[PDB]
Design a protein around this ligand. Structure first.
Ligand SMILES: [K+]
Ligand SMILES: [K+]
Ligand SMILES: [Mg+2]
Ligand SMILES: [Mg+2]
Ligand SMILES: [Mg+2]
Ligand SMILES: [Mg+2]
Ligand SMILES: [Mg+2]
Ligand SMILES: [Mg+2]
Ligand SMILES: [Mg+2]
Ligand SMILES: [Mg+2]
Ligand SMILES: [Mg+2]
Ligand SMILES: [Mg+2]
Ligand SMILES: [Mg+2]
Ligand SMILES: [Mg+2]
Ligand SMILES: [Mg+2]
Ligand SMILES: [Mg+2]
Ligand SMILES: [Mg+2]
Ligand SMILES: [Mg+2]
Ligand SMILES: [Mg+2]
Ligand SMILES: [Mg+2]
Ligand SMILES: [Mg+2]
Ligand SMILES: [Mg+2]
Ligand SMILES: [Mg+2]
Ligand SMILES: [Mg+2]
Ligand SMILES: [Mg+2]
Ligand SMILES: [Mg+2]
Ligand SMILES: [Mg+2]
Ligand SMILES: [Mg+2]
Ligand SMILES: [Mg+2]
Ligand SMILES: [Mg+2]
Ligand SMILES: [Mg+2]
Ligand SMILES: [Mg+2]
Ligand SMILES: [Mg+2]
Ligand SMILES: [Mg+2]
Ligand SMILES: [Mg+2]
Ligand SMILES: [Mg+2]
Ligand SMILES: [Mg+2]
Ligand SMILES: [Mg+2]
Ligand SMILES: [Mg+2]
Ligand SMILES: [Mg+2]
Ligand SMILES: [Mg+2]
Ligand SMILES: [Mg+2]
Ligand SMILES: [Mg+2]
Ligand SMILES: [Mg+2]
Ligand SMILES: [Mg+2]
Ligand code: NA
Ligand code: NA
Ligand code: NA
Ligand code: NA
Ligand code: NA
Lengths: 167, 182, 260, 71
RNA sequence: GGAAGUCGGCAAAAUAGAUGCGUAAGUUCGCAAGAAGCAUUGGCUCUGAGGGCAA
RNA sequence: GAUCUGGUUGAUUCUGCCAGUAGUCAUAUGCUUGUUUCAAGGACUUAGCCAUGCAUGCCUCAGAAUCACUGCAGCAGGAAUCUGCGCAUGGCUCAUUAAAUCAGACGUAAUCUGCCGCAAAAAUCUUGCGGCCGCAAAAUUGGAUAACUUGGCGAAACGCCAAGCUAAUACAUGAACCAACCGGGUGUUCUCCAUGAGACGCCCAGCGAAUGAAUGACAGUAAAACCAAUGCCUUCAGUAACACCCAGCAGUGUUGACUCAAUUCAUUCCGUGCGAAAGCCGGCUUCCGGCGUCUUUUGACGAACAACUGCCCUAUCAGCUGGUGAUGGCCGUGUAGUGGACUGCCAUGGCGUUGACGGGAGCGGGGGAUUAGGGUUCGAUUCCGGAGAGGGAGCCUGAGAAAUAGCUACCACUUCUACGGAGGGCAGCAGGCGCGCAAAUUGCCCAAUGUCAAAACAAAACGAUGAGGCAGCGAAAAGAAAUAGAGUUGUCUUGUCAUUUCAAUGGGGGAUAUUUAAACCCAUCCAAUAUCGAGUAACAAUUGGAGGACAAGUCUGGUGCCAGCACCCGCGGUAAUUCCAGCUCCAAAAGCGUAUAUUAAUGCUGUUGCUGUUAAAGGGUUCGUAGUUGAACUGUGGGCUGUGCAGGGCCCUUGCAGCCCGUGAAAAGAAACAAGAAACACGGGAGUGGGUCGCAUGUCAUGCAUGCCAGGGGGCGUCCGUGAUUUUACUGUGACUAAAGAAGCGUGACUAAAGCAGUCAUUUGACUUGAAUUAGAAAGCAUGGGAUAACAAAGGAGCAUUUUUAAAGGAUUGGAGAUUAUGGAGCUG
RNA sequence: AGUGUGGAGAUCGAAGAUGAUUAGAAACCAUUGUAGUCCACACUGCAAACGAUGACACCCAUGAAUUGGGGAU
């Protein structure tokens, strides 16, 4: 009653519940990135769909439309900041080519694994959940934390963790 | 109670309005004064905003203007002789705006004498000569003044203001009402 | 009559959060319209932060510490809109209520002998009993003997301490105006032409410093000086110059990067 | 508006014909409104004449406009 | 009280003029119809409407 | 992500539905459930019925205290009661409702408006003292009534009498001089002139209201006479007016437009308006502050009314309205005000197949769901608008109510009683009973947000608030996220396996504490000298399935067309891939089934975008009225230079300057061109009549005033008068358009759903921090464009030269108004 | 086809009659026969009222024909 705090969904189910190729591809993504359920892949799917829909809407406009100049710049900035796109490519058309592993690569679980602090993505998951990982000295316990390119050099074991400077 | 709203009226299509609210105080009407001629009796009506309307039930004196001489006088009303709405109101002696009444004429005669020295100090005689130079009383007026009753038209609303004021009938309007009264 | 004001229904420029409470202080009748005002409680609590909540705001205001146009105002629901001078002598801060280029309320700091003057736009002229001409201003002031050249739409520069007229700024081509309503509120420009549409809203065609052209209804322009160079009032930082959105975003990004 | 009837004393009926757009079908509809207008004896409009009218205070149950000019 | 009387409402009671409003099934479309029903009419004192002859 | 698959045949290709599939802040129900964040929550059925309790009161320096009240030694608190304000807001619900309500956009010049802002105010014969007069002056006004006391009545009653006291800022009354300016009417009153002029006497002359009469401007003709009065020079040029004491104390309100603002004159309020509250409190007898209140006024907050475009289905609803108001007129009445709102009288109107009238379902929007697009659908419910308080209708008070935790009555129900009587209104909060498929605690609190109010906070001294907030219950829905990580030996490069080793961590238990109004949650920690805990990590994950659609067994037992399954196709009749079970496997997973709706799937409602020979579907044939739709045509602009894979001196691009930009006809004028043009004319037109330290006028004058580019011709601004006429639609711009919600910028609230915050500095502060931007039908407003169109008119024989001069005829200066005539400009021949 | 009023009434022929066939045969077949069938006037308004194909307008390949009107030899 008279409460105006917003909320929304972040994922959607596939239209076809049993496609063998989709099911196999998702099980592969789960095994290789160490996910708990298909909802994580579907969350990435919704994020990618929203970004791609924005890019299509922007590309339909003439190149010097002020909305294109503003929002294309913003979306390129975000993609470069989070490492979804390589900093070399800077056109609006490269967002359309983004794939699910491109976003999954920037998860804190995958990043911790690729940085050598963990023996596997499964080790990385439990390492993050147990407060042993800090990003710029801030303990991050969320494996789905999307790491900016600027924060990649500040990922170390937490000071309070027994693997850092803690008891 | 009495309402002034349009809800009870038929639509122009002839269909019936389906009312879905009770009647409001802000659209009320009140019972008419039906002011009659007689010794003064007025009843205040508290109106919207806290202001007071004066509802006159009986009146017998009015402030009546002689427009051509640009003056006015407080005079006794003698009879109401014509009403355009219905001659039932002439019969009931009802005072409403634009009804024709007969007012006492003697004050207008006395003012006529004081202002012109005519009955139908040297400096005042100088003034009397200064006037009358382009002045000619009407025959239709002066004839009425001699018999002591002038026809006048009520200009106020006795149901609203509590006053039966008016103006003396002159000219084509006086001829119009004189024709209708014979 | 409505005594309450829902927070969602309150004007957006008051910067009241939708989650902080159900209600907002309903402005009382007074000098300014409630859709075009900034209540004293809002000023003292949300804008100046001298009070942390409404109770402290009442403690501050009921003591008469806050002066509007040289008079102490003890009501947190006092309207206190455009061009008003607010003074709190105990802390020494003094300012004029203005519109910034984004159209929000701005508290432009004033010096003494600048706070003794306020500009008032004439909205009506009528004759009072005794054949006394009276000018009604946008602030609800009724000035009893204005300059005989005063017209509806002109500006009266007014000494609030002495309660006296000082000068008159007529509404003519080439004059400096500020927009007080609509999409262009807060922009400073020059009157280039005012087309008259009798029985309709007259449209004033304006031109800012950078040569950007814009228009608005004649009711929304406020003469503030003879030229954009010499204004009779101090104006907020941006000087009424609307900035490109792309340019604004880029400059903000670069400045933030420089800060880090 | 166009004058539609002159049967009343000092009052005329006018028609305002216009096209109403239906968004779904991207097409227009012919529609008309009818307004009772007070006509001063200063004008003598006939059926089919064009008139300029101006809004005034209520003059009767339906009349809200006055004939201002007859084309 | 109200058909319990009587073979049977027989007898009696009842309804009532004029005017306005209103009037079902059915129907050979003519009616049914005065269907059924509702209301009003006194006395006084006035007001309005409805004409003819002549210059 | 602009997507389909199973079922009709022996097989095939169709049509077509059925079934499948995904979503729903979309409800219910079943099974299941460790952690945390964010949230809906008796709308659907019964606008059904309700026990109990609480929901609206307010006092400080500043209205009234002799409590027989308290503390102190008169001061200070101060129960009660009177007085002033509020209780018309908020909260709840969605029953009614289709020229109603509502959205956007307009009006009120048709009106009312307490509280709030800024202002205004010179009416008024009062009081005390001697005998109506005299004197005098800081006005020392009068009767009541509460609380209280006494007697009490009554079963009771948010029921009552009667006598005593006594206050107010309650109520009533009432203030001369000080004290102005201005005007009108008048004396058989005096001077003074020849009918003027001046004094003096008295009758009035305030705000607001009523009637009447005037003002509330002018703005397309330039000049000289005469009579009368009056101004001037002297004994007719200049000149606002004004017959002195103010020689400029309004000759000038506003609008788009006013019978409005305001002013003058006359008459009237007054029997229902107008105090300096005859008020209160502070500083220093003296002044100077802060409040409080009457009347007038206008702008703010509102109220009420009107309606430009839009708004479901139904013709097995075709006519609707007009005794007795239907549509319009006239004079009234009533209202705050307009109005058939209403009386009387007149006239026949008004509406309708572009769907009236009637019937049905619905409160309307902001918005939600779904969506390539176009669409379909939902919207009781947080914001805005409307409406109601069991049903109906009346009403008082009040600025505002047709009020309901106000009154009055009736109808239903219904409570107490001593039987005399007296009461009630949860669609407020909580909670019952019923109804149902269907929806929480008779909890804590005013800390936050606000409202009211005589009110800052605090000091003997804490305003009320079920509005609101907080917690409880709560798998509606939404976000994040456990149920393990690394190994060793062998077994069988991996990978399963029996082990047998390490660490790690929450769930949980606690706390120096933190949070919170207090609690509870979240965070922080398991020493800082000094702080618990996993190995079947038993701290043990489920719900549906495994023939096809559709991911996953041709396993093993049981049953034997039974039991059962199966949304559809089908399975089961003794070797069941389908039932009942075990095992194993599959899908989603702290969730997962089922039912009913609804969106997509659906080009199976088709504008985009369907079908009609035989699958459903062209009327038997014509005629025909609204309706829809409807053929061409008024129209290639030209020269000059340079530049281009131009192409077979020309045309064609690109680009700069020329055109009277078809012919004609020339600094001016003529032809087209103009209404946004042209011809006139207005200082009351324009920041003085626009762009082009001395002199002069007069000087009884804040004349302390005014001029110091003349003049011509042009260009302009404002306002008025007279003259040809062009719209709509579309399209481009611009303006006007609540938040919440949708997009979107920025920002590591640990992430995210969110939110509009926060960030940075060796530290009393920067960032003169941020809180960008959009879209949001249709109608409405201004304006550019003229190709496609529409509306209107016409129907081509009612279709008709520019000037010059001349003769003939029939408003302005002049000293200003007046009067009175010449003299013209301006009309036909 | 059917209806009403007048007329007509040769043929054929719903109803009906009789004879066959047949398990039965209310049928098919045979012989008959009423109403009808035909006309005037007035109704009815239905057909596989069919091209199961609405009306108007434009473009559209080839050969032999056919009905009416024109033109040339
Ligand atoms: K209420
Ligand atoms: K709660
Ligand atoms: Mg019997
Ligand atoms: Mg018997
Ligand atoms: Mg009998
Ligand atoms: Mg019948
Ligand atoms: Mg009968
Ligand atoms: Mg009868
Ligand atoms: Mg088959
Ligand atoms: Mg077969
Ligand atoms: Mg509810
Ligand atoms: Mg209910
Ligand atoms: Mg006190
Ligand atoms: Mg309310
Ligand atoms: Mg509720
Ligand atoms: Mg006024
Ligand atoms: Mg009417
Ligand atoms: Mg309903
Ligand atoms: Mg709703
Ligand atoms: Mg509401
Ligand atoms: Mg109500
Ligand atoms: Mg109820
Ligand atoms: Mg009530
Ligand atoms: Mg209640
Ligand atoms: Mg008793
Ligand atoms: Mg009741
Ligand atoms: Mg309740
Ligand atoms: Mg309810
Ligand atoms: Mg409740
Ligand atoms: Mg439930
Ligand atoms: Mg509540
Ligand atoms: Mg078996
Ligand atoms: Mg078996
Ligand atoms: Mg089988
Ligand atoms: Mg089809
Ligand atoms: Mg067909
Ligand atoms: Mg077919
Ligand atoms: Mg067929
Ligand atoms: Mg037919
Ligand atoms: Mg035809
Ligand atoms: Mg036949
Ligand atoms: Mg025959
Ligand atoms: Mg035969
Ligand atoms: Mg056979
Ligand atoms: Mg035979
Ligand atoms: Na006074
Ligand atoms: Na009237
Ligand atoms: Na099985
Ligand atoms: Na089963
Ligand atoms: Na056929």
């Amino acid at each position: 009653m008279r409460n105006y705090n917003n909320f929304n969904r972040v994922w959607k189910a596939p239209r076809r519940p049993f496609e063998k190729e989709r099911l196999d591809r998702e099980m592969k993504l789960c095994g290789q990135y160490g996910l708990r359920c298909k909802r994580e892949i579907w969350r990435v799917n919704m994020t990618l769909s929203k970004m791609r829909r924005t890019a299509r809407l922007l590309l339909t406009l003439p190149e010097n439309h002020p909305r294109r100049l503003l929002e294309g710049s913003a979306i390129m900035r975000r993609c470069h900041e989070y490492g979804f796109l390589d900093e070399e490519k800077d056109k609006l058309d490269y967002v359309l080519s983004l794939t699910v592993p491109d976003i999954l690569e920037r998860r804190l679980q995958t990043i911790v694994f690729k940085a050598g602090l963990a023996k596997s993505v499964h080790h990385a998951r439990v390492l993050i959940q147990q407060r042993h990982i800090a990003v710029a000295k801030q303990i991050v316990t969320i494996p789905s934390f999307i790491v900016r390119v600027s924060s990649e050099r500040h990922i170390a074991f937490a000071d309070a963790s027994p693997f850092g400077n803690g008891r | 109670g009495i309402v002034r709203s349009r809800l009870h009226k038929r639509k122009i299509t002839g269909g019936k309005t389906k009312i879905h609210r009770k009647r409001m105080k802000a659209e009320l009407g009140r019972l008419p004064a039906n002011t009659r001629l007689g010794a003064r009796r007025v009843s205040p009506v508290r109106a919207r905003g806290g202001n007071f309307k004066i509802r006159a039930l009986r009146l017998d004196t009015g402030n009546f203007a002689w427009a051509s001489e640009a003056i006015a006088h407080r005079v006794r009303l003698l009879d109401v002789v014509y009403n355009a709405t219905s001659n039932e109101l002439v019969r009931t002696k009802t005072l409403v705006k634009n009804c024709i009444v007969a007012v006492d004429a003697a004050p207008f005669k006395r003012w006529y004498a004081k202002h012109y020295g005519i009955d139908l100090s040297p400096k005042l005689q100088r003034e009397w000569t200064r006037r009358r130079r382009n002045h000619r009383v009407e025959k239709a007026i002066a004839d009425q003044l001699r018999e002591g009753r002038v026809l006048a038209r009520i200009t106020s609303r006795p149901g609203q203001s509590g006053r039966a004021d008016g103006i003396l009938l002159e000219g084509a309007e006086l001829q119009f009402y004189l024709k209708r009264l014979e | 009559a409505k005594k309450h004001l829902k927070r969602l229904y309150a004007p957006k420029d008051w910067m009241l959060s939708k989650l902080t409470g159900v209600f907002a202080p309903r402005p009382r009748p007074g000098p300014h319209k409630l859709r075009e005002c900034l209540p004293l409680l809002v000023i003292i609590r949300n804008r100046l932060k001298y009070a942390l909540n409404a109770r402290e705001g009442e403690m501050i205001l009921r003591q008469g510490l806050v002066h509007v146009d040289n008079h102490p105002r003890r009501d947190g629901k006092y309207p206190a809109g455009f061009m008003d001078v607010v003074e709190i002598p105990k802390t020494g801060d003094r300012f004029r209520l203005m519109y910034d280029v984004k159209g929000r309320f701005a508290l432009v700091n004033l010096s003494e002998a600048e706070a003794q003057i306020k500009l008032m736009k004439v909205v009506n002229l009528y004759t009072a009993t005794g054949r006394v001409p009276v000018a009604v201003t946008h602030d609800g002031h009724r000035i009893r003997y204005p300059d005989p050249h005063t017209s509806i739409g002109d500006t009266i520069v007014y000494n609030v301490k002495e309660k006296k007229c000082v000068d008159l700024i007529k509404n003519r081509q080439g004059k400096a105006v500020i927009v007080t309503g609509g999409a262009n509120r807060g922009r400073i420009g020059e009157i280039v032409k005012v087309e008259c549409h009798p029985g309709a809203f007259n449209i004033a065609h304006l031109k800012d410093a950078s040569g950007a052209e814009f228009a608005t209804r004649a009711a929304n322009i406020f003469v503030i000086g003879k030229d954009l160079n010499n204004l009779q009032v101090t104006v907020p930082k941006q000087q009424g110059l609307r900035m490109n959105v792309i340019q604004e975003r880029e400059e903000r990004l670069i400045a933030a990067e420089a800060r880090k | 508006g166009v004058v539609h009837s002159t049967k009343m004393h000092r009052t005329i009926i006018i028609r305002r014909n216009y096209l109403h757009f239906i968004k779904k079908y991207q097409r227009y509809q012919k529609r008309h409104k009818s307004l009772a207008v007070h006509c001063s004896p200063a004008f003598d409009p006939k059926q089919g004449d064009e008139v300029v009218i101006g809004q005034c205070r209520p003059l009767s149950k339906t009349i809200r406009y006055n004939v201002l000019e007859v084309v």
